[PDB]
């Protein structure tokens, strides 16, 4: 909003200064081209330090920080008392005109004092709160020259020929905050601020701003008509080449944006818009009542209404769909009650100074807050008794926090509020140093000193935007910007560029990856994304309704995905149609209750229902008849008990909400301990299972010990102990693993933090097994070579096209005695359909019959069918949320598997006989904490196994309750599992978080996509597009650093 539609005013509002304290001191500057007001920054600019009351006849005129005028009738006795004006009722004027006048703001509980000067004028002399925190304004020769804050600092304002040139922090420290210059006519020409922007301005003789610019890329030219109305803008880089048309007879203003769109506004006598029509013809109307908004109706006809109480606050909001929100206040305008549908009520209680001392939630639970005399929050008591405490520095910023467990976190900040140091409950200190660029452009550097010795650098440019980041190993990422602070380039530590380009309204239209290929986006006249074409040339098209809700997505093959919405913008129905026939191939329904809570989702393959309690907490999720029930801790809203098929689990949590005990089906419980930083140091079962874990100064998981709790009986726990250690480089890449069961692993990483060499060694210094990796410009795998005992074992080179693997050569060697000869030689080719889905993988094994895989998909790019080299057919089905619920062999003698879920967690794999009968009594239950993707236990036929997981949450060991190691994982870098376990050992198909191995394909099912752990890629494009990254097929650049549990 650069232009006031109701007047044609050019408008600008910029932050100037923001000083922390008990009473925060904030300053800004507001510009209006046709304004007549003056502030501390000269004519045409207004500010919060220049408000004044002036006598006009029998009225007092209040001039606020925008130049708006509110009138107050002077009482017969000349004494104001809680006097208000309905146009802005939150302002309350009190006081005798012969003494001093006070404006109380009901919105903030702050007060402004105005003192008599000259010609019936009351200038701003103080600001204070209800605790007495006060800022005094000192004026000499009529000019504001000093400010004294009760926290203990002072400001000095420097004037030259009655023009403000400087604002300085004077005591207890001397610091320049703002510097100003003016043109030949006295208008503010330049304003450099220490915390915010540094801008220049140019004006006509009347003060009409014809140009403004920043320090580098932004420069805008504004043109006015003879009446002072803004008619055009244009930035030097082309952005916002806009025009403005005015029809004062019709009271209509037209906005012609730089991309050909036309927006018409109809305004009232107060300049408020009563009706607008957007570039697509969509209309929105508003009803005003003396500058007070009473209703608003969108293009769909949905109306939101606002009622008000006798004091000017909103008392009722009527929402589309019959929902109303009620607001009640105390005599000072502080919200004391909020009433929402579903009989949800919040209560706030205030003491004599306006401090919020007690909050009552809809369930009647109370939170008590205790304050100091000057308003500092000192203590908070939660419903369960958990107590937080805070102390504060001289500027009333928090300097120490005591957690419910007594752990203390100390923070230190400077006068500008920048963080200087942090000492955690275990005494580890991180330091932050800042330094300004005194030479050249106005850059700055921030250095981070971590308690492990790591030093990191964070540089800013003259626009105070991130310019570069250098990690603890010296790798530097750089950033470049255009006008309006648009990110135009990212330069990776390896030197490669990622570029972005925008249209004349600053909407992103093109991304260029390091390879040089382009991802393009197209918009309609209203800014809605109507098309996008990825690097593979695949185009999707979108359609929206009158409220901007996407109602159709069109795929290259012709299919449409239609969506219908309820009045509350919730998807009620989804449909799949094909081509020119609007024939429905499938439909998915979503049903909601009277509180708009999803109660049933249904497609052709699954029905999912949800039950709720009065607090809208999910108490039951059912999937095709399989019901999981929940109970909740009454104080923490955490799951305290869950049951599926008669098997009940119990969750016990501490004051902070940490898991302290877990128990299932009457088995011996699992108890867990945490340290003062909240990190788990041990978990334990009296049956015998025991696991200790320790962390680095920055919280890295770095040590694990299992078995022999007290080192009392090493002979008894022989072959049932584990010592594991993880070491990291100064960029926090996992570079070394010590594992008492497997050996030692050493990793080398690239500047992109990608592993280029991984070596496992056991008892011989020569590495037993090595993996060597190379990557292309998009950080996708190219080369993989393996070595066994220092002998070349196999070599593969895969080739990407448009970011997805297309072909690969592979060869393997047999070792003769010292010689090597090729014993396997094969080329693989990948083939994708026009929608970006892998449809064929063909392996030409030289000297053999070819091996071919074929994949069938649905319109949502879900893998519905798989054909093997032998001709067998597997089939998969998914619920309305994309959760695979079943797996069937459609043409052989292979038992199927049903899948049960809790939210995003695969909780049960249920064997299905060839006659289709599920074997619920043989189900394998995986135990997760709710919301977590890391399993803690496994339950099958009354047998409980505990897990030990690595640094990414992957299972490495399964142990019985008494601590016997039964399963041992062994993986190649990118996830291929190949540990050899006993035949009777429990199966463990879980891999990386969210991944499940299908033994019929070797693929890892990963929620929304299937993962190829050999190519390191997914079998189709990311269904969320750019929102998952610019690598649409890649898994993660480093599989020991990042995870992707949803496959997105």
- State the SS3 of 812-855: EEEEECCEEEEEEEEEEEEEECCCCEEEEEEEEECCCCCEEEEE
Cα gap 940→665, rounded to integer Å? 12
Residue 802 exposed, middle or buried by CB count within 10 Å (0-12, 13-18, 19+): middle
Q: Could you tell me if 157 and 40 are in contact, meaning their C-beta atoms sit under 8 angstroms apart?
A: yes
- Other C-beta atoms lying within 10 Å of the C-beta of residue 887: 22
Q: Could you tell me if 542 and 553 are in contact, meaning their C-beta atoms sit under 8 angstroms apart?
A: yes
DSSP 612: E
Instruction: For residue 779, give both structure tokens.
Output: 């950080």
Q: Determine, yes or no, domain membership for 397.
A: no
Q: Identify whether residues 134 and 281 lie together within a single domain.
A: yes
Pairing of strands 680-685, 121-128: unpaired
From the list 524, 565, 526, the residue with the least C-alpha distance to 542 is 524
Cα gap 408→633, rounded to integer Å? 27
- Counts for the chain of helices (H) and strands (E), in that order: 0, 93
Instruction: For residue 999, give both structure tokens.
Output: 């033994």
Q: Identify whether residues 177 and 210 lie together within a single domain.
A: yes
Q: Could you tell me if 335 and 349 are in contact, meaning their C-beta atoms sit under 8 angstroms apart?
A: no
Instruction: For residue 282, give both structure tokens.
Output: 């969509």
Q: Which residue has the tokens 């097929």?
A: 1033
Cα gap 732→212, rounded to integer Å? 44
Q: Could you tell me if 886 and 877 are in contact, meaning their C-beta atoms sit under 8 angstroms apart?
A: yes
972 annotated to a ligand binding site: no
How far apart are the two ends of the chain, measured CA to CA in Å?
A: 36
Q: Identify whether residues 365 and 425 lie together within a single domain.
A: no
Q: Determine, yes or no, domain membership for 982.
A: no
Residue 1 exposed, middle or buried by CB count within 10 Å (0-12, 13-18, 19+): exposed
Instruction: For residue 180, give both structure tokens.
Output: 């100003």
Q: Identify whether residues 374 and 519 lie together within a single domain.
A: no
Q: Determine, yes or no, domain membership for 806.
A: no
| Residues contacting 1041, CB < 8 A, separation 6+ | 732, 733, 734, 753, 952
Q: Identify whether residues 41 and 115 lie together within a single domain.
A: yes
Cα gap 782→776, rounded to integer Å? 6
Q: Which residue has the tokens 């459609």?
A: 890
Give the HSE-up count for residue 45: Cα atoms under 13 Å, Cβ half-sphere: 27
* ∠ CA 336-342-345, rounded to 5°: 15
Residue 1027 DSSP SS3: helix
Q: Could you tell me if 898 and 892 are in contact, meaning their C-beta atoms sit under 8 angstroms apart?
A: no
Q: Identify whether residues 367 and 459 lie together within a single domain.
A: no
Q: Could you tell me if 977 and 984 are in contact, meaning their C-beta atoms sit under 8 angstroms apart?
A: no
Buried b (16+ CB within 10 A) or exposed e, 435-445: eeeeeeebbeb
Q: Identify whether residues 149 and 62 lie together within a single domain.
A: yes
User: What method was applied to determine this entry?
Assistant: X-ray
Cα gap 851→1002, rounded to integer Å? 14
396 annotated to a ligand binding site: no
Pairing of strands 955-960, 965-968: antiparallel
Q: Determine, yes or no, domain membership for 351.
A: yes
Cα radius of gyration (the chain): 34
Query: Can you spell out the DSSP letters for 380-442?
Result: EE-TTS-EEEEEE-TTS-EEEEE-TTS-EEEEEE-TT--EEEEE-TT--EEEEEEEE--SSSS
Peptide bond into 172 cis (omega under 30): yes
- Other C-beta atoms lying within 10 Å of the C-beta of residue 719: 8
* φ and ψ of 1025, to 5 deg: 70, -140
Q: Determine, yes or no, domain membership for 849.
A: no
Q: Determine, yes or no, domain membership for 577.
A: no
Domain extent, residue 422, equals: 406-470
Chain-centroid distance, C-alpha 694: 29
Cα gap 343→680, rounded to integer Å? 39
Residue 460 DSSP SS3: strand
From the list 944, 1039, 1030, the residue with the least C-alpha distance to 994 is 1039
Instruction: For residue 211, give both structure tokens.
Output: 């140009």
Q: Identify whether residues 352 and 377 lie together within a single domain.
A: yes
Residue 172 exposed, middle or buried by CB count within 10 Å (0-12, 13-18, 19+): exposed
3-state secondary structure string, 736-774?
EEEECCCEEEEEEECCCCCEEEEEEECCCCCCCEEEEEE
DSSP 987: P
Q: Could you tell me if 127 and 113 are in contact, meaning their C-beta atoms sit under 8 angstroms apart?
A: yes
Q: Determine, yes or no, domain membership for 88.
A: yes
From the list 800, 850, 810, 862, the residue with the least C-alpha distance to 830 is 800
Q: Identify whether residues 164 and 185 lie together within a single domain.
A: yes
Q: Domain end: 511, 539, 567, which one? A: 539
- Other C-beta atoms lying within 10 Å of the C-beta of residue 461: 20
Residue 88 DSSP SS3: helix
Q: Domain end: 470, 499, 520, which one? A: 470
Residue 1028 DSSP SS3: helix
Residue 560 DSSP SS3: strand
Instruction: For residue 703, give both structure tokens.
Output: 């040590």
What sign does the dihedral 233-234-240-242 (CA atoms) show? positive
Tell me the C-alpha to C-alpha distance, in Å, between residue 43 and each of 416, 648, 667.
29, 73, 78
Q: Identify whether residues 33 and 82 lie together within a single domain.
A: yes
Determine the length of the chain: 1048
Q: Identify whether residues 219 and 363 lie together within a single domain.
A: no
| Residues contacting 900, CB < 8 A, separation 6+ | 623, 626, 628, 644, 885, 906, 907, 908, 909, 910, 923
61 annotated to a ligand binding site: yes
Q: Identify whether residues 450 and 479 lie together within a single domain.
A: no
Cα gap 573→549, rounded to integer Å? 13
- Other C-beta atoms lying within 10 Å of the C-beta of residue 610: 16
- If phi > 0 it is left, if psi is from -120 to 50 it is alpha, else beta; for residue 929 that is beta
Strand extents, DSSP E, 605-710: 607-612, 618-623, 626-632, 639-644, 647-653, 659-664, 670-674, 680-685, 690-695, 701-706
Cα gap 868→876, rounded to integer Å? 14
Q: Domain end: 437, 470, 503, which one? A: 470
Q: Determine, yes or no, domain membership for 350.
A: yes
| Residues contacting 658, CB < 8 A, separation 6+ | 672, 674, 678, 680
From the list 6, 521, 30, 87, the residue with the least C-alpha distance to 274 is 6
Q: What is the count of structural domains for the chain?
A: 4
């Amino acid at each position: 909003e650069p232009v006031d539609i109701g007047t044609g005013d050019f408008l600008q509002h910029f932050s100037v200064l923001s000083l922390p304290g008990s009473l925060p001191l904030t300053l800004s500057r507001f510009y209006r081209s046709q304004a007549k007001g003056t502030g501390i920054f000269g004519p045409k600019w207004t500010d919060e330090w220049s408000c004044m009351l002036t006598v006009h006849g029998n009225d007092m005129h209040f001039t606020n920080h925008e130049g708006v005028d509110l009138y107050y009738r002077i009482p017969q006795n000349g004494i104001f008392r809680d006097t208000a004006n309905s146009r802005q009722a939150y302002y309350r004027l009190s006081g005798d005109i012969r003494d001093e006048l006070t404006i109380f703001d009901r919105r903030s509980q702050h007060s402004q004092i105005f003192s008599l000067t000259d010609n019936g004028i009351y200038l701003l002399s103080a600001i204070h709160d209800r605790y007495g925190n006060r800022a005094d304004f000192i004026r000499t020769e009529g000019l504001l020259t000093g400010i004294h804050h009760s926290d203990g600092y002072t400001l000095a304002l420097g004037w030259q020929q009655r023009q403000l040139v400087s604002i300085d922090l004077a005591t207890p420290q001397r610091q320049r905050l703002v510097t100003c210059h003016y043109d030949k006519n006295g208008y503010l020409a330049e304003c450099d601020t220490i915390q915010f922007s540094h801008l220049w301005h140019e004006y006509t003789s009347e003060g009409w701003m014809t140009r403004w610019r920043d320090t580098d890329k932004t420069c805008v030219d504004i043109v006015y008509d003879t009446l002072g109305r803004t008619v055009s803008t244009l930035s030097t880089e082309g952005y916002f080449d806009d025009q403005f048309l005015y029809n004062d007879d019709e009271k209509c203003t037209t906005y012609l944006d730089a991309e050909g769109g036309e927006t018409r506004y109809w305004y009232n006598g107060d300049g408020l818009v009563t009706r607008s029509i957007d570039p697509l013809g969509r209309e929105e109307t508003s009803v005003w009542e003396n500058t007070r908004l009473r209703s608003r109706t969108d293009a769909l006809g949905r109306t939101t209404a606002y009622d008000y109480n006798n004091e000017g606050e909103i008392s009722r909001v009527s929402l589309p769909g019959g929902y109303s929100l009620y607001y009640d206040y105390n005599e000072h305008g502080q919200l004391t009650r909020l009433s929402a549908p579903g009989n949800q009520v919040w209560l706030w209680e205030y003491d004599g100074k306006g401090s919020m001392v007690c909050l009552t939630d809809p369930q009647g639970r109370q939170q008590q807050f205790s304050y100091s005399e000057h308003g500092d929050l000192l203590r908070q008591i939660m419903p369960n008794g958990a107590t937080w405490r805070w102390s504060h520095d001289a500027l009333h910023q928090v300097r120490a926090t005591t957690a419910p467990d007594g752990g203390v976190t100390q923070t230190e900040q400077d006068i500008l509020g920048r963080l200087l140091s942090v000492k955690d409950p275990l005494g580890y200190t991180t330091q932050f140093r800042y330094s300004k660029n005194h030479a050249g452009p106005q850059g700055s550097v921030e250095e981070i000193r971590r308690p492990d010795g790591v030093r990191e650098l964070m540089r800013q440019n003259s626009e105070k935007l991130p310019e570069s980041f250098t990690d603890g190993e010296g790798n530097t990422t750089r950033y470049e910007y255009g006008a309006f602070d648009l990110l135009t380039a990212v330069i990776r530590p390896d030197g490669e560029r990622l570029a972005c380009r925008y249209d004349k309204l600053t909407r992103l239209t093109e991304i260029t990856n390091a390879e040089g290929e382009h991802y393009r986006l197209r918009y309609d006249k209203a800014g809605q994304l109507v098309a996008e074409t990825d690097f593979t040339g695949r185009t999707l098209t979108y359609s929206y309704d009158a409220a901007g809700r996407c109602i159709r997505t069109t795929f290259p093959d012709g299919t449409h995905l239609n969506r219908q919405y309820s009045t509350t913008d919730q998807v009620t129905r989804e449909e799949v149609a094909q081509g020119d026939s609007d024939r429905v191939l499938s439909c998915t329904t979503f049903i909601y209750d009277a509180l708009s809570r999803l109660t049933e989702a249904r497609n052709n393959d699954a029905t999912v229902t949800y039950e709720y309690d009065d607090a809208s907490r999910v108490t039951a999720e059912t999937i095709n008849g399989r019901r999981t029930e929940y109970n909740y801790d009454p104080d923490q809203d955490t799951v305290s008990q869950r049951t599926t098929a008669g098997i009940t689990e119990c969750f016990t949590r501490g004051l902070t909400g940490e898991l302290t005990q877990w128990q299932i089906d009457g088995h011996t419980p699992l108890t867990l301990e945490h340290d003062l930083r909240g990190q788990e140091i041990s978990r334990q079962s009296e049956a015998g299972f025991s696991l200790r874990q320790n962390y680095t100064p920055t919280g890295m998981l770095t040590g694990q010990q299992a078995g022999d709790l007290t080192e009392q009986n090493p002979h008894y726990w022989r072959n049932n102990t584990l010592q594991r250690q993880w070491l990291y480089d100064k960029a926090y890449n996992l570079t070394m693993i010590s594992d008492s069961l497997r050996g030692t692993m050493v990793n080398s990483v690239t500047a992109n933090d990608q592993i280029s060499h991984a070596t496992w060694t056991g008892s011989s210094d020569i590495p037993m097994r090595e993996e060597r990796f190379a990557y292309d410009r998009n950080l996708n795998i190219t080369r993989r070579q393996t070595q066994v005992n220092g002998v070349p074992d196999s070599e593969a080179y895969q080739h990407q096209q448009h970011g997805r693997v297309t072909s690969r050569e592979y060869k393997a060697w047999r070792h003769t005695t010292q010689f090597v000869r090729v014993i396997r030689d094969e080329q693989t080719t990948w083939k994708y359909d026009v929608n970006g889905r892998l449809v064929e993988k063909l392996i030409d094994k030289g000297g053999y019959r070819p091996l071919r895989w074929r994949y069938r998909w649905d319109a949502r790019s879900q893998l519905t069918g798989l054909e093997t080299p032998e001709g067998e057919r597997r089939e998969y089905k998914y619920d309305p949320f994309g959760r695979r619920i079943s797996k069937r062999c459609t043409n052989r003698d292979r038992p199927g598997t049903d899948f049960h879920w809790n939210g995003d967690q695969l909780t049960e794999e249920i064997p299905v006989g060839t006659d289709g009968t599920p074997e619920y009594e043989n189900a394998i239950r995986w135990i997760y904490e709710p919301g977590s993707f890391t399993p803690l236990a496994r339950y099958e036929k009354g047998q409980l196994h505990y897990t030990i997981t690595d640094t990414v949450g992957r299972i490495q060991e399964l142990l019985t309750e008494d601590g016997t190691i039964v399963w041992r994982g062994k993986q190649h870098l990118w996830g291929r599992e190949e540990g050899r376990n006993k035949d009777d050992a429990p199966s463990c198909r879980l891999r990386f978080p969210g991944q499940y191995e299908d033994e019929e394909s070797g693929l890892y099912y990963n929620r929304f996509r299937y993962y190829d752990c050999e190519a390191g890629q997914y079998l189709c494009a990311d269904p969320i597009g750019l929102r998952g990254g610019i690598n649409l097929y890649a898994y993660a650049p480093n599989p020991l650093s990042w995870i992707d549990p949803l496959g997105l």
